[PDB]
Amino acid sequence: ADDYATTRYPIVLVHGLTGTDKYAGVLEYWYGIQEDLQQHGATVYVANLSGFQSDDGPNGRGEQLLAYVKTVLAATGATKVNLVGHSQGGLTSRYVAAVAPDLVASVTTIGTPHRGSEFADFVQGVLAYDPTGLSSSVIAAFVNVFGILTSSSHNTNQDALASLKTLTTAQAATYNQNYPSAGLGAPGSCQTGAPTETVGGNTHLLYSWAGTAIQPTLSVFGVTGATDTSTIPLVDPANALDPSTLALFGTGTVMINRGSGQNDGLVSKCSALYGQVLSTSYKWNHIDEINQLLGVRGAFAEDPVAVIRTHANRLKLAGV
Ligand SMILES: [Ca+2]
């Protein structure tokens, strides 16, 4: 142990889509990340939210995280928390920072779809092929059941259609109207905002980084494709050890062909820009950013545990 990650306020890890604090009470969302930070002096709590929901609304993940933050303050005696959200967890962290800015000292987002996901637009467009709405209805039930069975608490508050609509590029822009932040650039700029914000008399430090392993490719005859820069081509063992490696390459290719640009399989670079952009050069797919699956990543992917460990030290040096 040491003092490398000892922050002034406790760190709250906020999971994103499909997530929980521990899948089926067996698999940690933040694989081995809580243990590493505590091994370097950090006080780390892991939120358990609805894997499928909107962030606003009484049943949304935001109120769940607001209530969970309070239980962390009452257990540590601390006044504020350092919110670190991955994927939709960054959207949930922005909600808590906007409705209770006194309880938050910083907001860090990892691969967060601040402008939505082109793959969410794709999925919603595919479901529209059945005008009866029965395909969407049956698929949502099975997805909601998936969230019930994988939630460490069997959380039955699962809304797959609200979750899908929340991550669309059109609805995420409405979310940025309802919860604007100085860390966001103008809509459609592919530019970040300010490194800090002052909301309700509290100064929040805003951070973000993104994985861009899935890159657009050249093509004569004029239709784009994709390559996975995180992996040794064709033969990288992560293709076999981690099913999400090829799965996120396919979803990312669907995003490229919809005009997303470089992405991590589900969130593009422009949609992930927030506050102080520390890096968008990580050769990571969407769950490489959380050391998944079970730590397996492509031979070109950087260590995400050390990156998160360094940021905890960065929060320690920044005074929070
Ligand atoms: Ca991986």
TrEMBL record:
What InterPro entries would the database entry show?
Answer: AB_hydrolase_1, AB_hydrolase_fold
Among the Pfam families in the record, one is Abhydrolase_1
The UniProt keyword set, sorted, is: Calcium, Hydrolase, Metal-binding, Signal
Cystine pairings recorded for this chain: 190-270
What superkingdom does the record give? Bacteria
Name of the featured protein: Alpha/beta hydrolase
Annotated AB hydrolase-1 domain residues: 9-222
